[PDB]
Structure 1
Amino acid sequence: HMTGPMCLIENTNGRLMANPEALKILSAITQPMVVVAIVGLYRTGKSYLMNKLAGKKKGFSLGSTVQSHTKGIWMWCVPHPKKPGHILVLLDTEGLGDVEKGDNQNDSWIFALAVLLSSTFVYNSIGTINQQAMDQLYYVTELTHRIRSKSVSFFPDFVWTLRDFSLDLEADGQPLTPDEYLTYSLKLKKGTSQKDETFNLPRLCIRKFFPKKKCFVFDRPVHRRKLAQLEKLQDEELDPEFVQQVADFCSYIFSNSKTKTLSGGIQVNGPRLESLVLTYVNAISSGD
């Protein structure tokens, strides 16, 4: 179908704008869509990983340096490898926490669209699950509600991805599967005090918002850094357990991600996505 990705939402001087040439494309796509989005801190291997879902080396473009690379949000519409008659829609996001940009508001808008447009949301981090991440995920989650405001589940399913993973998956003595880890980290605290409650308040809203959760670890894809010629490498050349792990991740998405859905049940196709995108983007550029 589509040979490479194109920018869906442009990001210039803190204005987010739909790119009309993508809407023109969405608007022609009649099949239902599974939508996968990914976000995380910047320089964190997101675009590389998205590309593995499209089963191509080279697509969403990479960038090698300390400078951020992906700006705005890029979509890529491809045939669904495992659900005949569906399109897979990949969303690649500008990474959070650019110091070049120094703009948390803007971060939050992008984060929010991702969650809003997606039927599987993919939060990417390096090494550990981390409270500053928890936090932000909560904040954006609440934000999402407030955006739906202007204008049997349809909230997206969730995946945490852990990169360059090093540490023993172990805790309080006993082994952990990546999923036991992720629920360890949303594990509510006994009962009440009021700081027993401070806690919980994020963990609750997160356990509620995302029906399905899943988690995957990933070893460094290469032992030195020949880490920068990565658009170019086969799979011999990579650490085999990274290839194992990727494969596992792709199979989960292909086999579990659901068809994107509006409220009241209707399945989202091209034009229904086009219309969301406008709706949500128009909502952001007006008055809270």
Structure 2
Amino acid sequence: MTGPMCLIENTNGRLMANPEALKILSAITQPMVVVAIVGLYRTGKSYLMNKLAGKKKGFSLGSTVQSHTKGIWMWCVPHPKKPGHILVLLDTEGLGDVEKGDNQNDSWIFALAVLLSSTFVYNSIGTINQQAMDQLYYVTELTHRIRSKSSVEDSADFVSFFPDFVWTLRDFSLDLEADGQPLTPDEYLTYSLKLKKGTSQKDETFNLPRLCIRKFFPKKKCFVFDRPVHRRKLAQLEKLQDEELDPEFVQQVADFCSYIFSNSKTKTLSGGIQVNGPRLESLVLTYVNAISSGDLPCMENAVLALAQIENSAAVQKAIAHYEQQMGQKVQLPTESLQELLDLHRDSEREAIEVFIRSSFKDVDHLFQKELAAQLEKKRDDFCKQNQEASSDRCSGLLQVIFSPLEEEVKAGIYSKPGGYRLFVQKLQDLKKKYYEEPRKGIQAEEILQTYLKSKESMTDAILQTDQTLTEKEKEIEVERVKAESAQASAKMLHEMQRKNEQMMEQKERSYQEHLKQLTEKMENDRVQLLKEQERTLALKLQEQEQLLKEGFQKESRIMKNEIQDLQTKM
């Protein structure tokens, strides 16, 4: 991207995804660290975001008195500290002072920034006083804009998926002086979010936004920035060189950028899923569609929506893998059914592995069941092709090997004295030849036996004709031939029975292979979820302790409540 592009348009009160932007996202396959900035209009948000892009000329800037950015803009640039990663910068339409009304989608822009980011930067001018905290109603209001799941307490889940929070304070006017040594900006943020005792409406209003920031975001950070230049040059800031700006401001910006580059994490969804272009595109579509539908954007629903897409593709990818492996290894007709089934089993195992590693949230295992159904059909097709190839080969061999004999018999070559011995010897030699032919396939015994049985009268015809054989000797031969026919029948019957057994055995083995890989994936998913829950537990215990140490039992006890509820889910 040579420059930023609008990702979400905001026109006539409607938010809509920019198709051109979605197209760009579909092409970025690398993991993304998403940093979004929000705050009152004209507070230097776009200017600061251009610093992260590390380039002049990026997001367009406005004046110090008029709003500029509209909707949500994105700029995907290579991450300067993480090779193989993309840094996605989201610049947003400046918030208005609610105590003025209008600006309908302010809250939604704010909520989308929270849902789409890895790091959420709240930018304001001044200090953290009552005036500043009143504007944070936008954070308090998140409980009315975002839903964690669809299956006063839903917000208890926010800390598990919300971005890290960074408060950037512009034109900072405090020296932060304190007994001994000055407060650091992070200590100043802690000081600023401390609660006030009391149950009055005023007390509740003071504590609410502070509690929301402390409880909804997993990590908080603060950076202060001095006035960049003299008031008469603020409007030319973009064209000024670092040497023309306050040295401390230049260093503060450098420290902010360094922190972002070193601490902002790859955007992740439940299950450790790392968000890349196609995945972010899905989230944008789902959340914006929800808002456009008059519904609340829901994290759970978005993950599931993403699952639907990737799981469908996973089934197709697995089937493709199966077809490829079978095609590269099969030689028809196969020497035996075991040969074909062994190849099928191996290809199927690899295909299921492809599906398992490419899928997630396959509720009710519906997608894996679909895969199983498709592989079974594929297996049936190969089996049919194999039997057909065998039938063709064996019937062909029958023509090549036995036809000459049949014709000799019809020509009377064996109807002379001593012809029976010559005939039986020739027939045995020909049956041996048939059996020694390579890769006849699974129909070898059935094709031969059916033929030999249909021509049974031939043997008797030659026998009774030969005069060089006594009647007793002929009686012996008739019984010998009857015994050989019965043995040929047994070979055909066993061939039939064994094939059925092998098919049944393969059916059971395939079922067990699916179960094995599924059980293993479910186990891995359980471990990953518990790990995520343990992190949330750690974050909530931490806050509970801070609240108690701060002297607030009423709020600290409320935390213990959320902790108990989390533990019922573990």
Question: Contact 1:157 / 1:211 at 8 angstroms: preserved in 2?
Answer: yes
SS at match of 2:28: coil
What is the CA deviation profile of residues 115-134 of structure 1, one whole-angstrom value per residue up to 9, with x for unaligned ones? 11111000000011134543
SS at match of 1:258: coil
Q: What is the rounded CA distance, in whole Å, between the counterparts of 2:183 and 2:287 in structure 1?
A: 39
Cα deviation for residue 13 of structure 1 reads 1.1
- Out of 280, 295, 301, the residue aligned to residue 273 of structure 1 is 280
- The unaligned stretches of length 5 or more in structure 1 are none
Worse overlay, 211-220 or 167-176? 167-176
Count the aligned residue pairs: 286
Cα deviation for residue 102 of structure 1 reads 4.8
Question: Contact 2:25 / 2:278 at 8 angstroms: preserved in 1?
Answer: yes
Question: Contact 1:58 / 1:232 at 8 angstroms: preserved in 2?
Answer: no
What is the CA deviation profile of residues 217-275 of structure 1, one whole-angstrom value per residue up to 9, with x for unaligned ones? 11111124222222222111111111111101100000000110112221111011001
Cα deviation for residue 141 of structure 1 reads 5.1
What is the CA deviation profile of residues 55-101 of structure 1, one whole-angstrom value per residue up to 9, with x for unaligned ones? 00110011225221111111000000111111000000110117999
1:173–1:194 CA distance, 2 compared to 1 (3 A): farther
Q: What is the rounded CA distance, in whole Å, between the counterparts of 1:215 and 1:239 in structure 2?
A: 20
What is the CA deviation profile of residues 123-172 of structure 1, one whole-angstrom value per residue up to 9, with x for unaligned ones? 0000111345435545435526743358x943100100111112221468
Question: Contact 1:138 / 1:206 at 8 angstroms: preserved in 2?
Answer: no
Counterpart in the other structure of 1:221: 228
Question: Contact 2:139 / 2:213 at 8 angstroms: preserved in 1?
Answer: no
Worse overlay, 93-102 or 17-26? 93-102
Q: What is the rounded CA distance, in whole Å, between the counterparts of 1:65 and 1:178 in structure 2?
A: 25
SS at match of 1:91: strand
1:144–1:133 CA distance, 2 compared to 1 (3 A): farther
Query: Percent of aligned positions with the same letter in both sequences?
Result: 100
Q: Are 1:240 and 2:252 counterparts?
A: no
Cα deviation for residue 188 of structure 1 reads 2.8
Question: Contact 1:158 / 1:214 at 8 angstroms: preserved in 2?
Answer: yes
1:264–1:130 CA distance, 2 compared to 1 (3 A): farther
Q: What is the rounded CA distance, in whole Å, between the counterparts of 2:106 and 2:213 in structure 1?
A: 19
Cα deviation for residue 43 of structure 1 reads 0.5
Question: Contact 2:140 / 2:208 at 8 angstroms: preserved in 1?
Answer: no
1:274–1:239 CA distance, 2 compared to 1 (3 A): same
Higher RCO, 1 vs 2 (CA within 8 Å, ≥6 residues apart): 1
Q: What is the rounded CA distance, in whole Å, between the counterparts of 2:19 and 2:65 in structure 1?
A: 31
1:199–1:232 CA distance, 2 compared to 1 (3 A): closer
1:141–1:23 CA distance, 2 compared to 1 (3 A): farther
RMSD: 2.6
Cα deviation for residue 21 of structure 1 reads 0.4
Greater than 4 Å deviation, 4+ residue runs: 98-102, 171-174, 190-199
1:101–1:128 CA distance, 2 compared to 1 (3 A): closer
SS at match of 2:104: helix
Counterpart in the other structure of 2:192: 185
Question: Contact 2:72 / 2:91 at 8 angstroms: preserved in 1?
Answer: yes
Greater Rg by CA: 2
Worse overlay, 137-146 or 174-183? 137-146
Question: Contact 2:71 / 2:92 at 8 angstroms: preserved in 1?
Answer: yes
Worse overlay, 270-279 or 152-161? 152-161
Question: Contact 2:114 / 2:163 at 8 angstroms: preserved in 1?
Answer: yes
Q: What is the rounded CA distance, in whole Å, between the counterparts of 2:18 and 2:85 in structure 1?
A: 23
1:145–1:154 CA distance, 2 compared to 1 (3 A): farther
SS at match of 1:198: helix
Cα deviation for residue 175 of structure 1 reads 2.8
1:196–1:71 CA distance, 2 compared to 1 (3 A): closer
Matches within 5 A, 1:59-70: 59-64=58-63, 66-70=65-69
1:191–1:66 CA distance, 2 compared to 1 (3 A): closer
